[PDB]
């Protein structure tokens, strides 16, 4: 069975355990339990669906198919998470 | 100067220095011989006790005292490899390397030896790759080049001569200091080559200073004495005379000969002529692809053994070793450093990686192999090589024009930056005399700068190659997928898919996927299995579903059966590796000894599969290929038939695809079958391919070493049938041969094949597994 | 295309406070975003202040009240000074 | 064999990554995750590169602040190891969870 699905669904596993460890090191965490990574993947996914849903709404209002950075800045500012350095 | 504005806010001062030191954290911090490579093992540790106890499996403790392992230690020279034992080692670094070696190698060795489910093919391929591993490790014992010699003081050993030795298949990072005695007792030819290179009579500092004062070149009808080699042919000497006459005029050039003619032999003979005859023994640079690198190294070692040809690959430490031990005659100095080498071989990756360490070298000649990679002016290799201070450049390629005139404009701008300019394209809808005058002006402009020798003008033993274009209809599934994509039907394209994630970005790519096979799309095989084969999927209806799903490969099934009845081997080229997976599964359920090649296969398994296909006792019948992989360094001498399943946008890829079996000296007539879907999006792909062939026959083929007729042929539209037998010759292999299959559901899977499949299914059900 | 920005004004203010210090393009993008964000905050607060008082115009009193509301503490206290004399200097000229 | 005690390498990484400014998540896995999340809202979505970079920078900022509050929760519970309940408590007090 060489053939398989073209699309990939485990892209939340692409946020690897060393990446989450580096994020915790930047946050100042010395010791990390083994169940941290699944919870971090879940909260990152929830945050990303919120921001991406608002940015897709901003894109669809402008009758566009691409998602610009300015829509992402709008979506983050609407959630009280203003980001500097991408225009505006 | 002074700030004109200040802050009146009385905030406290803040030290913003984020730099830190871990010297306070040294309380738990810090304030070369060990096992490196295990090569071979022997079943007798000290002596053979007997042939008893040959059954069962041994554990790790049993294998600790029963086997001796060949060890190359850390920072050694692959000649002090010792047959050691676990109790003879003690506790050194890298012991767990030997633990992993012994453990898992003995586990799958005894597993494949004790398994009754082992075929002969698996044991012979693993034995053959084991032998390849064994003599690949044994090749490291042979030295290849001596870099430097020194006098070193050992432990009360007075003064000893010590050589820097490089080995055969390894790099300069592992080059070792070794004794002189075993080196001169092993291979004294490399030693005397080293003393010849030490007080050599040819240096870059002794080169001539020809500044637009080069002498005239007389034609040579005899092989020069300083190029020993083997035998140099007449067309090679003609190319030598052409390159020498181009260098005498101070002009750059393109050696546009076909592959297989020995362009490497021609350019090594030209480099030897420049070094020896014209006394231009200065620093030369040759940029080659990585896959063709040993084919240039052995040519330098054979044809011009007196040259100081050096190699440039490796990591940062190997390139540092080459840079600081071998570039300069006097690297210990601080002023101007003269060059010690003569020719430097490198690849594109280390041209871009080491622009700064190579651009400050007064090169005398540049030779760039496979110049079509340099076809883009905006690619980073173009600005990397165009910034080099080189007086004379030369481009070696097989396809000078690939898609348009702009590629040739980029090549002639890299060669002569300013003399040649091109500002107009070619329009087939114009058909005016000004375009023909422009074509003739381009013919008369780059005529002495292009030397192209065909495979038919020289070596008059090549069998002809015939390309047949086969246009086949579509299935009902292919037609409904084509109308669903073209008239976008996301609700209908979802249908029974649970995910429902259909991406219609790049519409034409999805149209090509629908024209190739419906099973490339996700959740598409289940509808065919539940609509025609009623969802049982019991080892027989799945092959029939593969047959009826794609309208292309029923003709491929008929062709493979017809060429199975004949004594020929077939290559199948494709653009997508998922379609190659579809054919691999089709041959797996079909049960045909097949081999596969794509980009995911590493080069060792590539070499394994090529040697398995090219053996005289090969049981392989069909070889699947991805079209744009491997370059020109793949030989398919045993192949006879080439089937282009998917056409390429650049037809030079198709020519190099069908040139894998159509090499020099082929003993059979090469037949090419192209599988094209009727009334689909591939027709304009074939139209653009035929337009590029018309452009290639116009500019390149008529200016080697009736224009309106081929212009009108390119302006038009191109839109006993599988027999393996066969100006106006250029018009051939362009007609479209329509094929009528009319194969229904019950015609495929005949009685003998279905009976064999049912017997195999019953044998698998009886034996379980 | 003429795309307006606060680039040259931020650069000349930088040359006032640090005459020998350069700046990168990403830092200029961040400074432009900061100026636009603070302008939007102060203008929105002044618009709300004019709306709550049933006034149809935005004056310097509304901007002063918005600066006192938004800017925290002593950052307001100097800025309320820094605006006021500028307005006074404008009154000395126009 | 030279070894370090468990914790000084962690302090060295904390000092290293609080000095640096680059993103700590690789580009292609984050881009694939963004495209997978976005295709559940609208099919056939294109993406600018700067949009993916802005989404990334927002994501590491949110996760670094969340890990800071998680470390405060773990220290308050007389621990040096962070637990999923510390993340849950941080998101509960912050107001994102409940």
UniProtKB/Swiss-Prot annotation, chain A:
The keyword Phosphoprotein is annotated on this UniProt entry: yes
Name under which the protein is recorded: Histone H4
GO CC list: nucleosome; nucleus
Assembly and interaction partners: The nucleosome is a histone octamer containing two molecules each of H2A, H2B, H3 and H4 assembled in one H3-H4 heterotetramer and two H2A-H2B heterodimers. The octamer wraps approximately 147 bp of DNA.
Modified residues (N6-lactoyllysine): 2, 17, 63, 77
Modification N6-propionyllysine occurs at: 2, 17, 30, 63, 65, 77
Keywords: Acetylation, Chromosome, Citrullination, DNA-binding, Hydroxylation, Isopeptide bond, Methylation, Nucleosome core, Nucleus, Phosphoprotein, Ubl conjugation
Role: Core component of nucleosome. Nucleosomes wrap and compact DNA into chromatin, limiting DNA accessibility to the cellular machineries which require DNA as a template. Histones thereby play a central role in transcription regulation, DNA repair, DNA replication and chromosomal stability. DNA accessibility is regulated via a complex set of post-translational modifications of histones, also called histone code, and nucleosome remodeling.
Residues with the N6-succinyllysine modification: 17, 63, 77
Modification sites for N6-methylated lysine: 6
Xref: CDD domains: HFD_H4
PTM (free text): Demethylation is performed by JMJD6. Monomethylated, dimethylated or trimethylated at Lys-6 (H4K20me1, H4K20me2, H4K20me3). Monomethylation is performed by KMT5A/SET8. Trimethylation is performed by KMT5B and KMT5C and induces gene silencing.
Family: Belongs to the histone H4 family.
Residues bearing PTM N6-(2-hydroxyisobutyryl)lysine: 2, 17, 30, 45, 63, 65, 77
Chain residue numbers at which the record places covalent cross-link Glycyl lysine isopeptide (Lys-Gly) (interchain with G-Cter in UFM1): 17
SUPFAM superfamilies (alphabetical): Histone-fold (SSF47113)
Lineage of the species this protein comes from: Eukaryota, Metazoa, Chordata, Craniata, Vertebrata
Residues recorded as bearing N6,N6-dimethyllysine in the entry: 6
Annotated S-S bridges: none
Modified residues (Phosphoserine): 33
UniProtKB/Swiss-Prot annotation, chain B:
Effect of residue 172 to E: Disrupts interaction with methylated histone H3 'K-4'; abrogates histone acetylation activity of SLIK
Principal EC category: hydrolase
EC number assigned by the record: 3.6.4.-
Domain Helicase ATP-binding per the UniProt entry, residue ranges: 244-418
Bilayer-crossing regions: none
Keyword Nucleotidyltransferase tagged: no
Phenotype reported upon loss of the gene: Decreased sensitivity to the cytotoxic effects of 6-azauracil.
GO cellular component: chromatin; mitochondrion; nucleolar chromatin; nucleus; SAGA complex; site of double-strand break; SLIK (SAGA-like) complex
Catalytic reactions on record: ATP + H2O = ADP + phosphate + H(+)
UniProt keyword terms in alphabetical order: ATP-binding, Chromatin regulator, DNA-binding, Hydrolase, Isopeptide bond, Nucleotide-binding, Nucleus, Phosphoprotein, Repeat, Transcription, Transcription regulation, Ubl conjugation
Motif segment (DEAH box): 369-372
GO MF term set: ATP binding; ATP hydrolysis activity; ATP-dependent activity, acting on DNA; ATP-dependent chromatin remodeler activity; chromatin binding; chromatin DNA binding; DNA binding; helicase activity
Residues annotated as domain Chromo: 51-113, 141-206
Binding site for ATP: 257-264
GO biological process terms, semicolon-separated: chromatin remodeling; DNA double-strand break processing; double-strand break repair via homologous recombination; negative regulation of DNA-templated DNA replication; nucleosome organization; regulation of chromatin organization; regulation of transcription by RNA polymerase II; regulation of transcriptional start site selection at RNA polymerase II promoter
Compartment list: Nucleus
Record's keyword annotation contains Iron: no
Domain Helicase C-terminal: 555-705
Compositional bias (Polar residues): 5-18
Bias (Acidic residues) ranges: 20-31
UniProt domain comment: The 2 chromodomains are involved in the binding to the histone H3 methyllysine at position 4 (H3K4me3).
Other notes: Present with 1620 molecules/cell in log phase SD medium.
Protein family membership: Belongs to the SNF2/RAD54 helicase family.
UniProt name for this protein: Chromo domain-containing protein 1
Source organism of the structure: Saccharomyces cerevisiae (strain ATCC 204508 / S288c) (Baker's yeast)
Portion of the full sequence shown: 122 to 956 of 1468
Curated annotation (Swiss-Prot), chain C:
Organism: Xenopus laevis
Source species taxonomy: Eukaryota, Metazoa, Chordata, Craniata, Vertebrata
Gene Ontology molecular function, alphabetical: DNA binding; protein heterodimerization activity; structural constituent of chromatin
Post-translational modification comment from the UniProt entry: Monoubiquitination of Lys-89 by BRE1 gives a specific tag for epigenetic transcriptional activation and is also prerequisite for histone H3 'Lys-4' and 'Lys-79' methylation. GlcNAcylation at Ser-81 promotes monoubiquitination of Lys-89. It fluctuates in response to extracellular glucose, and associates with transcribed genes.
Family: Belongs to the histone H2B family.
Positions glycosylated per UniProt: 81
Chain positions of cross-link Glycyl lysine isopeptide (Lys-Gly) (interchain with G-Cter in ubiquitin): 89
Assembly, per entry: The nucleosome is a histone octamer containing two molecules each of H2A, H2B, H3 and H4 assembled in one H3-H4 heterotetramer and two H2A-H2B heterodimers. The octamer wraps approximately 147 bp of DNA.
Signal sequence segment: none
Its job: Core component of nucleosome. Nucleosomes wrap and compact DNA into chromatin, limiting DNA accessibility to the cellular machineries which require DNA as a template. Histones thereby play a central role in transcription regulation, DNA repair, DNA replication and chromosomal stability. DNA accessibility is regulated via a complex set of post-translational modifications of histones, also called histone code, and nucleosome remodeling.
Main location: nucleus
Keyword terms: Acetylation, Chromosome, DNA-binding, Glycoprotein, Isopeptide bond, Nucleosome core, Nucleus, Phosphoprotein, Ubl conjugation
Subcellular location: Nucleus; Chromosome
Protein name: Histone H2B 1.1
GO cellular component: nucleosome; nucleus
């Amino acid at each position: 069975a060489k053939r398989h699905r073209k699309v990939l669904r485990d892209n939340i596993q692409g946020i690897t355990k060393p990446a989450i460890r580096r994020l915790a090191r930047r946050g100042g965490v010395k010791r990390i339990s083994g169940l941290i990574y699944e919870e971090t993947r879940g909260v990152l996914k929830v945050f990303l669906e919120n921001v991406i849903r608002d940015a897709v709404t901003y894109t669809e209002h402008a009758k566009r198919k691409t998602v610009t950075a300015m829509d992402v800045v709008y979506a983050l500012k609407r959630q009280g998470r203003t980001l500097y350095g991408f225009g505006g | 100067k002074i700030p004109t504005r200040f802050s009146n806010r009385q905030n406290k001062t803040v030290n913003y220095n984020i730099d830190y030191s871990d010297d306070d954290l040294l309380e738990s911090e810090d304030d070369f011989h060990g096992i490196d490579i295990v090569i071979n093992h022997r079943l007798k540790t000290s002596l053979e006790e007997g042939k008893v106890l040959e059954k069962t499996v041994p554990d790790l403790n049993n294998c600790k005292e029963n086997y001796e392992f060949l060890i190359k230690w850390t920072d050694e020279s692959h000649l002090h490899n010792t047959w050691e034992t676990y109790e003879s080692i003690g506790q050194v670094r890298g012991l767990k390397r030997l633990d992993n070696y012994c453990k898992q190698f003995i586990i799958e060795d005894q597993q494949v030896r004790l398994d009754p489910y082992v075929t002969a093919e698996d044991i012979e391929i693993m034995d053959m790759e084991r032998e390849r591993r064994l003599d690949e490790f044994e090749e490291f014992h042979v030295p290849e080049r001596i870099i430097d010699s020194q006098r070193a003081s050992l432990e009360d050993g007075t003064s000893q001569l010590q050589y820097l030795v490089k080995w055969r298949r390894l790099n300069y990072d592992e080059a070792t200091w070794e004794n002189a005695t075993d080196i001169v007792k092993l291979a004294p030819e490399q030693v005397k080559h080293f003393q010849n290179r030490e007080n050599s009579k040819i240096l870059p500092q002794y080169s001539s200073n020809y500044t637009s004062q080069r002498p005239r070149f007389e034609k040579l009808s005899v092989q020069p004495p300083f190029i020993k080699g083997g035998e140099l042919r007449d067309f090679q000497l003609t190319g030598i005379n052409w390159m020498a006459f181009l260098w005498s005029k101070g002009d750059n050039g393109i050696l546009a000969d076909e592959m297989g003619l020995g362009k490497t032999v021609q350019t090594v003979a030209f480099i030897s002529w420049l070094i020896f005859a014209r006394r231009q023994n200065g620093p030369h640079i040759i940029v080659v692809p990585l896959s063709t690198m040993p084919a240039w190294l052995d040519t330098f070692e054979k044809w011009a053994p007196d040259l100081n040809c050096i190699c440039y690959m490796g990591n940062q430490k190997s390139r540092d070793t080459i840079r600081e031990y071998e570039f300069y005659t006097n690297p210990r100095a601080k002023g101007k450093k003269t060059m010690k080498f003569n020719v430097l071989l490198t690849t594109y990756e280390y041209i871009l990686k080491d622009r700064a360490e190579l651009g400050s070298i007064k090169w005398q000649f540049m030779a760039v192999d496979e110049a079509h990679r340099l076809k883009n002016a905006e690619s980073s290799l173009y600005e990397s090589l165009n910034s080099f201070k080189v007086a004379n450049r030369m481009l070696i390629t097989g396809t000078p024009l690939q898609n348009n005139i702009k590629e040739l404009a980029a090549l002639v701008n890299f060669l002569m930056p300013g003399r040649f300019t091109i500002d107009q394209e070619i329009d087939f809808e114009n058909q005016d005399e000004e375009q023909e005058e422009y074509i003739h002006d381009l013919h008369r402009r780059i005529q002495p700068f292009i030397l192209r020798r065909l495979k038919k003008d020289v070596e008059k033993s090549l069998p002809s190659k015939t390309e047949r274009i086969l246009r086949v209809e579509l299935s009902d599934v292919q037609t409904e997928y084509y109308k669903n994509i073209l008239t976008k039907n996301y609700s209908a394209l979802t249908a029974g898919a649970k995910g429902g994630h259909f991406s219609l970005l790049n519409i034409m790519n999805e149209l090509k996927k629908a024209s190739n096979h419906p099973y490339l799309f996700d959740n598409a095989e289940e509808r065919v299995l539940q609509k025609f084969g009623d969802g049982k999927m019991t080892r027989e209806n799945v092959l029939r579903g593969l047959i009826m799903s794609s309208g292309k490969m029923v003709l491929l099934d008929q062709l493979l059966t017809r060429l199975k009845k004949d004594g020929h081997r077939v290559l199948i080229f494709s653009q997508m590796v998922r379609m190659l997976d579809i054919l691999g599964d089709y041959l797996s359920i079909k049960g045909i000894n097949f081999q596969r090649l794509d980009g995911t296969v590493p080069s060792a398994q590539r070499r394994i599969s090529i040697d398995h296909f090219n053996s005289p006792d090969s049981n392989d019948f069909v070889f699947l290929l991805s079209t744009r992989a491997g370059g020109l360094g793949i030989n398919l001498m045993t192949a006879d038939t080439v089937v282009i399943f998917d056409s390429d946008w650049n037809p030079q890829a198709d020519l190099q695809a069908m040139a894998r079996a159509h090499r020099i000296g082929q003993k059979n007539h090469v037949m090419v079958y192209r599988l094209v879907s009727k009334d689909t999006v591939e027709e304009e792909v074939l139209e653009r391919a035929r337009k590029k062939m018309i452009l290639e026959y116009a500019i390149i083929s008529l200016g080697v070493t009736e224009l309106s007729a081929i212009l009108k042929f390119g302006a038009g539209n191109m839109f006993d049938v599988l027999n393996h037998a066969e100006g106006e010759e250029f018009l051939k292999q362009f007609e479209v041969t329509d094929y009528k299959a009319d194969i229904d559901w019950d015609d495929i899977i005949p009685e003998e094949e279905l009976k064999k499949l049912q017997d195999e299914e019953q044998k698998r059900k009886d034996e379980e597994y | 295309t003429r795309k307006e920005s606060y680039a040259i004004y931020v650069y000349k203010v930088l040359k006032q406070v640090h005459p020998d210090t350069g700046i990168s393009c990403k830092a200029m993008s961040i400074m432009n975003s900061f100026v636009n964000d603070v302008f939007e905050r102060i203008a929105g607060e002044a618009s709300r202040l004019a709306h709550y008082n049933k006034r149809s115009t935005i004056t310097s009193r509304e901007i002063q009240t918005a600066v006192r509301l938004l800017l925290p503490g002593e950052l307001a206290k100097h800025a309320v000074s820094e605006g006021t004399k500028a307005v006074t200097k404008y009154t000395s000229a126009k | 064999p030279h070894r370090y005690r468990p914790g000084t390498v962690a302090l060295r990484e904390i000092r290293r990554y609080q000095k640096s400014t680059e993103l700590l998540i690789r580009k292609l896995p984050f881009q694939r995750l963004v495209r997978e999340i976005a295709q559940d809202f609208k099919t056939d979505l294109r993406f600018q590169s700067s949009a993916v970079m802005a989404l990334q920078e927002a994501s590491e900022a949110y996760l670094v602040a969340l890990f800071e509050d998680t470390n405060l929760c773990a220290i308050h519970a007389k621990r040096v190891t962070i637990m999923p309940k510390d993340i849950q408590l941080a998101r509960r007090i912050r107001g994102e969870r409940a």
